[PDB]
RNA sequence: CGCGACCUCAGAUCAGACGUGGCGACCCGCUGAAUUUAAGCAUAUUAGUCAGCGGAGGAGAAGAAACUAACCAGGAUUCCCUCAGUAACGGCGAGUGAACAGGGAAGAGCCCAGCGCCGAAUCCCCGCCCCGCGGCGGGGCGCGGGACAUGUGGCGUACGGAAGACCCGCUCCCCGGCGCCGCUCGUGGGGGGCCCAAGUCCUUCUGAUCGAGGCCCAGCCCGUGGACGGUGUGAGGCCGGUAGCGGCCCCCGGCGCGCCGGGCCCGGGUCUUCCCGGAGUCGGGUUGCUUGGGAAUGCAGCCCAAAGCGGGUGGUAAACUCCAUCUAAGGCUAAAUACCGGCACGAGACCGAUAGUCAACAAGUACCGUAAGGGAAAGUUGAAAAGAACUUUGAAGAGAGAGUUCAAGAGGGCGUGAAACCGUUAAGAGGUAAACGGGUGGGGUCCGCGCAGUCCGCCCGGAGGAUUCAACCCGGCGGCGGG
RNA sequence: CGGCGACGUCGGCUACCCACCCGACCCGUCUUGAAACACGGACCAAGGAGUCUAACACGUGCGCGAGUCGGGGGCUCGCACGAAAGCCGCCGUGGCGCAAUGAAGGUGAAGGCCGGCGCGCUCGCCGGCCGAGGUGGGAUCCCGAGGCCUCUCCAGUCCGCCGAGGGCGCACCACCGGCCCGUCUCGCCCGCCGCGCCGGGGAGGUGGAGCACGAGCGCACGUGUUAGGACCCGAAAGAUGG
RNA sequence: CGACCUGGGUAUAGGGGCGAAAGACUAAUCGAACCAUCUAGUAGCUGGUUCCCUCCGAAGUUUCCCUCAGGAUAGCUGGC
RNA sequence: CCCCGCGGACGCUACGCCGCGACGAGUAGGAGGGCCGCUGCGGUGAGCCUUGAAGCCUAGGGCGCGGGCCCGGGUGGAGCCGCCGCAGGUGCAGAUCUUGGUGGUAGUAGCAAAUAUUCAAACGAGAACUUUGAAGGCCGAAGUGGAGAAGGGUUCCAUGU
RNA sequence: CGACUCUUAGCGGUGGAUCACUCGGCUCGUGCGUCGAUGAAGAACGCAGCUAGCUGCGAGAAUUAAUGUGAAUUGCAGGACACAUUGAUCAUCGACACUUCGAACGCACUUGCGGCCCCGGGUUCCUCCCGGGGCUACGCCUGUCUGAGCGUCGCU
């Protein structure tokens, strides 16, 4: 269990930090697991969710095998809007239904220079962990 | 509670000719608070009766001889299968209740080999019972960081920590105790004697020079000797069945004489 | 009001004592803090004795305790004079010195100079510059035999 | 009868600096009550406390004996334990009340004035040159000013010191950098940034699940990680994290060596000759306060007013005498100690929206008072607004349908939704106000699987099945007993 | 032993409404006396009052026991728990207890039986023992004449129970002695590196919270008293600063 | 037509002011304002003082008290 | 020397079980017992729970002398309880108690100081009250008129509801 | 027969108890232990596209730069933003900036009025008007300059 005397286990403090987190660490909080193919291709497990990568919903009413591209990362409400995760409201217009990124799996990553740097940093740390625990 | 609580109001009693109770009332006007009772344990927003204070004497001191006595009693009760079973520790396939393992356990490093050792010692069913007993606490402890509760597993008593602490300590219920620093709060978890204890051989051997024999004092406590019995033979059945007791008795009066209806 | 037999009690609680109450909930923290400071000081004076300078043998004053002997504040100037240690040099090699204590008899004086001589024999003086030893000590014994003594230096026994 | 030097003063928006005000929990200096207790009350107590005023710092103050003791003596200050509710004070009433010794935490010592010697050796400022900047220093030059003999600096301070001799020992100081260690330390010294294990497997429950069952090889996988939080439920393996003498990057700080630039100057022992101290202060009288201090503990006002083998203290006033002990009237000083304010954390057998801070919320807010000041009430839709499109009546509020949702018998002061109180419906009753205790009766609502009323032990008879019943043989396991 | 039993009836004294007979004034409170023409109370919800600290006293439980107690400090990777627990012993300093008494100087708790000596002078030098005296009670324990036994008797084998009497006597109680300190009265001795305005001793009364083969210490709990806001609410007032 | 009425500006502040005087007035407060604090002031006096069953069960009397609406004391009570 | 039968109820949480006898008022007050109740902590129940916790409602079934408790039905939607110990801010009808809410009173008192309104039309869902017109009245220049100071602070002016 | 009244029950109201929840307190502990004339604390007024409060900020005004990060902010709109001839947002915060009162500083304030020195304009150097910038408080130390005295003296 936790032994560091400078990190808290208080429920109120943890909830306060979570709900008043600044957006640059709301980005960390809103991470998603990679698919098994991606987790084999890169030696990484999780990845912060991104505007233009495609995911599958694995829990809830919209779960299924359908790949849907992310269209919005609403960090204020801790949700993401995906392409076909939507419903008709009363007047007939369609509204996106936000779901938590922990309930999706990233199947393809929106790859750029920064994403590649983060992926290789995570893989290198995992590899040094494996060689330390060999 | 705060020493200031309920007493920062400047309220005063209205007197007695105003058809209200003589409790102090908040002064001024223009707010709901004005004219409301204050300072009283019966008043909303007032001071509680006899406010709790930080000098409550939270701590107690127990005689060292008493504490050593309790440790000895807990250790003695941990070697009787009826008492350990009555604490509910699933010692059914345990080969021997004073369960002693070789010293190489002290140098374990991974949790896998600790789990394997418990499985092969047949102490794993107690861990499974702890797993079954993990549930949420009822009440305000959930608000106050005691959210999850579980029962107590076996106590691993060691002599030297060459990694045994880290090998264990991720198994729920397991507490590891140094033989030289035995704790009654861990040996009799709820104040009830009979916790399942697994001894390392080194700890088991040091135990005799730690609390002493009845014919030699403890060599590691400088004044301690084991406490004495006021009853050597506690086998009441054998004592009563003994011929010497039976020779001295009068015959039993086993006939019942009930009320005679006066005709 | 008194009630039957009892003891005439005089509690000293007429003086707003509740504003001046010293709780002791920081006592374990204070013990930890002092222990850590002791460890840090011992690390700081690395081979020098942890407890500090050697204290003299001193007899307790009054008629109740004069059969007992304890450690004093420092060695007297007469003691240092007849032991042959300069009063300004003793404090650098770790001998405490009390300039205001006199010696009224010769037995205490002689006991304390024997104490000083024994300490001076037990001392390992490192050279000021480790490469060049002027008059400190032999490197053969100071390389191995130099360790930090724990507890008081030559503790005073009755 | 002008020009100079000094002294004592003045002015300046002169050149360069410095103080003010805030906070004030802790600390230092003053000032300072009454409620209260004494069963009244005046001394006393409350209390040297509240309020008032001033001054600081990260601590402050104190502090290296004009000490304690009376011993075989101890040895600065501060803090803890104890001494001790004691010695003592007290309408000797109520009440108050230390210290020494002892054991510990910490431990550290010193500097002037004076007396002396040294050609003022001393200091500040302004220029110019070089090395530098990171808080402005070093080195050098000035027939450049000024301070200062009405006393600057070096030696030196009660533990004695100085100077001469004689003897002995050369023994090695502190600063700011160049490169590099041990990488500084309970295994980074500190600050910051980014990362690092393992199920979203099979079958199912659900609105959603983190639920339930399972996962051959001794048991799904990781575990130095089964703290915690989030996520549509209640998660070690979904995510952030957690563990680790784990990883990477950036920045900061004191530690040794060779060298760099400058300072950097003799120490001890013996003998001889010298030199040695703080004054309207001590002390005394008296007055007022204060203290446990009692023929006066401390402080202060006024008056008197010192001495030098003297002076102070030696807890009963005084004289004589011996003794012990210190050396006042100048100064500095870390540590242990304190901390209801501040910055940043961690925790709890605490409270859980009339509680806990007054304040969980646009709270010292709204509002009240001329002002000083007084000062609230007020949390909860849902997983997701999916926050009710559209039709219809009405001028609209408001409705009836329809629709979303697991649920609107969750519809924007919306979780649950008690009681008091009210409306309607149903049943019953009613001229001694209602209500109540005891005893019945009637009616009503429900309950009883109520509605031909229990099971089961043995034996008898009948009608049927089936291994096999006993006894022997083999094997295993127990109980008891054994010189 | 009888009757009755499914869409109509059977049982359910509790529970809902109603009827009748008997009984029935509204609670709280102060009070000799409350239904009172005595006071508070329209109703409902939530809140609301012997608490904590310290100090004593006695009782009870625990540990150790002429001791007991580490509470302050220190040592154990510094720390999930753990601010816990464990340990110290030349850390027991100290506290309380083990000694009292006097204002103080001070002094300070062992006697009994048997012998030879002075004068066994109300007694001094010894010896031998034993080790807190005795009287009356006194739980318990010990001895115990005599009895209780078998199909029977002359004659012993082993112990069980009752038992008049007798004995040792716990604790405790009453009483009598004894000892220690203070203080009176009387009186004769002894001691010496200080011959003294020195020191010690005896007998008989009397004052003491004493002795007379210890019972305390620590912890916990209860009760009672007390100082504190002190079970809760309540003055008229007084003071300081604005 | 007057010791007249009145605006504004000023001065006097709490044991103080001001008063052709009533203890009048001093921000609806005056035989001592208002505000905060000491302060939860003290009360021998009034009011209240929260679950059940079982067992036992009173006193209003003595003595002393600036004692007479209160205490201490003995008695009566309960518990061990 | 039990044996054609190989056999023979229950009990004894010893803090348990059984027997017999007498007794039972109670304020102030004392004591004991409480498998009475509330909240939290240490143990324990391989406890309960989205196949439905707490809470609340109930002409439902019962238990206990009682404090109270258990069970059925409904509503609700996420946590809760038993036992052994521990610890309290632990039990309400009262306090002219505190805060909040709600009754009867009660569709009641009342909407009565300063003479007074009326006709038609317009707008409008709607007119005693608004607007226009007509009439009858009042203030009667020390005004119910026209303008300022102090004070207020946008009330001023249009448009709309 | 109805009304009315009472009791009980179903439903509906009124009300907001209960229960469950908790980004709040309270308590304890630890480590630091830092304000200001280089202008603090406090106050006032301003500042957003739509903005009243709270929060943030200062005429560069819900923020600039720099560094870290690495694609958002979001209630609506708008436009950015090759993420390499550098970048949304957030965090950090060392650069820059920081209105008016306030110890508050030219004098004064329930208002307002000066003086001195530079610069620009109307002037078309001479001093009037306008604007901009810098100064102008009290006390006090060291030094400087200018001084005063029938203070003490020297020389003439
Ligand atoms: Mg409160
Ligand atoms: Mg609950
Ligand atoms: Mg020390
Ligand atoms: Mg100047
Ligand atoms: Mg100041
Ligand atoms: Mg009094
Ligand atoms: Mg009184
Ligand atoms: Mg009085
Ligand atoms: Mg004060
Ligand atoms: Mg200081
Ligand atoms: Mg000082
Ligand atoms: Mg000195
Ligand atoms: Mg004492
Ligand atoms: Mg005093
Ligand atoms: Mg000099
Ligand atoms: Mg992970
Ligand atoms: Mg969860
Ligand atoms: Mg989890
Ligand atoms: Mg980590
Ligand atoms: Mg004397
Ligand atoms: Mg509140
Ligand atoms: Mg509530
Ligand atoms: Mg309306
Ligand atoms: Mg529902
Ligand atoms: Mg609702
Ligand atoms: Mg109804
Ligand atoms: Mg009454
Ligand atoms: Mg009467
Ligand atoms: Mg009555
Ligand atoms: Mg009457
Ligand atoms: Mg009346
Ligand atoms: Mg009355
Ligand atoms: Mg009432
Ligand atoms: Mg009434
Ligand atoms: Mg209540
Ligand atoms: Mg400890
Ligand atoms: Mg001792
Ligand atoms: Mg006797
Ligand atoms: Mg006697
Ligand atoms: Mg008593
Ligand atoms: Mg009170
Ligand atoms: Mg008075
Ligand atoms: Mg009069
Ligand atoms: Mg009061
Ligand atoms: Mg009298
Ligand atoms: Mg009365
Ligand atoms: Mg009877
Ligand atoms: Mg009775
Ligand atoms: Mg209460
Ligand atoms: Mg009530
Ligand atoms: Mg009552
Ligand atoms: Mg009417
Ligand atoms: Mg009318
Ligand atoms: Mg007219
Ligand atoms: Mg007009
Ligand atoms: Mg209802
Ligand atoms: Mg930027
Ligand atoms: Mg003016
Ligand atoms: Mg002159």
Curated annotation (Swiss-Prot), chain A:
UniProt cross-references to Gene3D superfamilies, sorted A to Z: 2.30.30.30
Primary localization: cytoplasm
Subunit and partners: Component of the large ribosomal subunit. Interacts with DHX33.
Domain of life: Eukaryota
Family indicated by similarity: Belongs to the universal ribosomal protein uL24 family.
Modification(s) after translation: Ufmylated by UFL1 in response to endoplasmic reticulum stress, promoting reticulophagy of endoplasmic reticulum sheets.
A UniProt-annotated Pfam family: Ribosomal_L26
Full protein name: Large ribosomal subunit protein uL24
Region (Disordered): 1-21
Pathology linked to this chain's protein: Diamond-Blackfan anemia 11: A form of Diamond-Blackfan anemia, a congenital non-regenerative hypoplastic anemia that usually presents early in infancy. Diamond-Blackfan anemia is characterized by a moderate to severe macrocytic anemia, erythroblastopenia, and an increased risk of malignancy. 30 to 40% of Diamond-Blackfan anemia patients present with short stature and congenital anomalies, the most frequent being craniofacial (Pierre-Robin syndrome and cleft palate), thumb and urogenital anomalies.
Family annotation (PROSITE patterns): RIBOSOMAL_L24
GO cellular component: a single term: cytosolic large ribosomal subunit
Localisation: Cytoplasm
InterPro entries per the UniProt record, alphabetical: KOW (IPR005824), Rib_uL2_dom2 (IPR014722), Ribosomal_uL24_CS (IPR005825), Ribosomal_uL24_euk/arc (IPR005756), Ribosomal_uL24_KOW (IPR041988), Translation_prot_SH3-like_sf (IPR008991)
Swiss-Prot record, chain B:
Top-level taxon in the UniProt lineage: Eukaryota
Modifications made to the protein after synthesis: Citrullinated by PADI4.
Zinc found in the keyword field: no
Chain segments annotated as transmembrane: none
One GO molecular-function entry: structural constituent of ribosome
Subcellular location: Cytoplasm
Positions carrying N6-acetyllysine: 53, 206
Numbered residues of crosslink Glycyl lysine isopeptide (Lys-Gly) (interchain with G-Cter in SUMO2): 186
Phosphoserine sites (modified residues): 237, 242
Post-translational modification Citrulline, affected residues: 247
Swiss-Prot/TrEMBL keywords: Acetylation, Citrullination, Cytoplasm, Isopeptide bond, Methylation, Phosphoprotein, Ribonucleoprotein, Ribosomal protein, Ubl conjugation
Omega-N-methylarginine modification, residue list: 44
One cellular-component annotation, GO: extracellular exosome
GO biological process: cytoplasmic translation; translation
Phosphothreonine carried by residues: 213
Family of this protein: Belongs to the universal ribosomal protein uL4 family.
Reported function: Component of the large ribosomal subunit. The ribosome is a large ribonucleoprotein complex responsible for the synthesis of proteins in the cell.
Subunit and interaction comment: Component of the large ribosomal subunit. May bind IPO9 with low affinity. Interacts with RBM3.
Protein name: Large ribosomal subunit protein uL4
Encoding gene per record: RPL4
Portion of the full-length sequence here: 54 to 316 of 427
From Swiss-Prot, chain C:
Residues that bear N6-acetyllysine: 15
Modified residues (Phosphoserine): 51, 76, 105
Biological process annotations from GO: blastocyst development; bone development; cytoplasmic translation; translation
Tissues/organs with expression: Higher levels of expression in benign breast lesions than in carcinomas.
Positions of crosslink type Glycyl lysine isopeptide (Lys-Gly) (interchain with G-Cter in SUMO2): 122, 144
Gene Ontology MF term list: RNA binding; structural constituent of ribosome
Coiled coil (residue ranges): none
Subcellular location: Cytoplasm
Record keywords: Acetylation, Cytoplasm, Disease variant, Dwarfism, Isopeptide bond, Phosphoprotein, Ribonucleoprotein, Ribosomal protein, Ubl conjugation
Entry's Gene Ontology cellular component terms: cytoplasm; cytosol; cytosolic large ribosomal subunit; cytosolic ribosome; endoplasmic reticulum; membrane; nucleolus; nucleus
Function: Component of the ribosome, a large ribonucleoprotein complex responsible for the synthesis of proteins in the cell. The small ribosomal subunit (SSU) binds messenger RNAs (mRNAs) and translates the encoded message by selecting cognate aminoacyl-transfer RNA (tRNA) molecules. The large subunit (LSU) contains the ribosomal catalytic site termed the peptidyl transferase center (PTC), which catalyzes the formation of peptide bonds, thereby polymerizing the amino acids delivered by tRNAs into a polypeptide chain.
Family: Belongs to the eukaryotic ribosomal protein eL13 family.
Subunit organization: Component of the 60S large ribosomal subunit (LSU).
UniProt disease link: Spondyloepimetaphyseal dysplasia, Isidor-Toutain type: An autosomal dominant bone disease characterized by early postnatal growth deficiency, severe short stature, genu varum, platyspondyly and severe epiphyseal and metaphyseal changes in the lower limbs.
Name of the protein in question: Large ribosomal subunit protein eL13
Organism name: Homo sapiens (Human)
Full-protein residues shown: 2 to 159 of 211
């Amino acid at each position: 269990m936790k032994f560091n005397p400078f990190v808290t286990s208080d429920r109120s403090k943890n909830r306060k930090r979570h709900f008043n987190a600044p957006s640059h660490i709301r980005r960390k909080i809103m991470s998603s697991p990679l698919s098994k193919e991606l987790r084999q291709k890169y030696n990484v497990r999780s990845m912060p969710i991104r505007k233009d990568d495609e995911v599958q919903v694995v829990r809830g009413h919209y779960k299924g095998q359908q790949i849907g591209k992310v269209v919005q990362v609403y960090r204020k409400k801790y949700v993401i809007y995906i392409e076909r995760v939507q419903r008709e409201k009363a007047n007939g217009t369609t509204v996106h239904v936000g779901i938590h990124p922990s309930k999706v799996v990233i199947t393809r990553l929106k790859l750029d220079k920064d994403r590649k740097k983060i992926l290789e940093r995570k893989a290198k740390s995992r590899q040094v962990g494996k060689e330390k625990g060999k | 509670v705060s020493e200031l609580a309920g007493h920062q109001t400047s309220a005063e009693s209205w007197g007695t000719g105003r058809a209200v109770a003589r409790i102090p009332r908040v002064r001024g006007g223009g707010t709901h608070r004005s004219g409301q009772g204050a300072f009283g344990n019966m008043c909303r927003g007032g001071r509680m009766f006899a406010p709790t204070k930080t000098w409550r004497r939270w701590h107690r001191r127990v005689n060292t001889t008493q504490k050593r006595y309790a440790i000895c009693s807990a250790l003695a009760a941990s070697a009787l299968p009826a008492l350990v079973m009555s604490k509910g520790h699933r010692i059914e396939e345990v080969p021997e209740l004073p369960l002693v393992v070789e010293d190489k356990v002290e140098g374990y490093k991974k949790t896998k080999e600790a789990v394997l050792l418990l499985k092969k010692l047949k102490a794993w069913n107690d861990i499974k019972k702890v797993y079954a007993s993990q549930r949420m606490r009822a009440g305000k402890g959930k608000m106050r960081n005691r959210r999850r509760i579980q029962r107590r597993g076996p106590c691993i008593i060691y002599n030297e920590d060459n990694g045994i602490i880290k090998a264990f300590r991720n198994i729920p219920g397991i507490t590891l105790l140094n033989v030289s620093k035995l704790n009654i709060l861990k040996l009799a978890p709820g104040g009830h004697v009979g916790r399942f204890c697994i001894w390392t051989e080194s700890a088991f051997r040091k135990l005799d020079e730690l609390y002493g024999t009845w014919r030699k004092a403890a060599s590691l406590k400088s004044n301690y000797n084991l406490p004495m019995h006021k009853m050597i033979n506690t086998d009441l059945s054998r004592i009563l069945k003994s011929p010497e007791i039976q020779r001295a008795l009068r015959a039993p009066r086993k006939k019942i004489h009930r009320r005679v209806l006066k005709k | 009001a008194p009630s039957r037999n009892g003891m005439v009690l005089k509690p000293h609680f007429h003086k707003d004592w509740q504003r001046r109450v010293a709780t002791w909930f920081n006592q374990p923290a204070r013990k930890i803090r002092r222990r850590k400071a002791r460890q840090a000081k011992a690390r700081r004076i690395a081979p020098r004795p942890a407890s500090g300078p050697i204290r003299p043998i001193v007899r307790c004053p009054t008629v109740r305790y004069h059969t007992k002997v304890r450690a004093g504040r420092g060695f007297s100037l007469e003691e240092l004079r007849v032991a042959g240690i300069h009063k300004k040099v003793a404090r650098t090699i770790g001998i405490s010195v009390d300039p205001r204590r006199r010696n009224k008899s010769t037995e205490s004086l002689q006991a304390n100079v024997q104490r000083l001589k024994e300490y001076r024999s037990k001392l390992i003086l490192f050279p000021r510059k480790p490469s060049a030893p002027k008059k400190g000590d032999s490197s053969a014994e100071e390389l191995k035999l130099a360790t930090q003594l724990t507890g008081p230096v030559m503790p005073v026994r009755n």
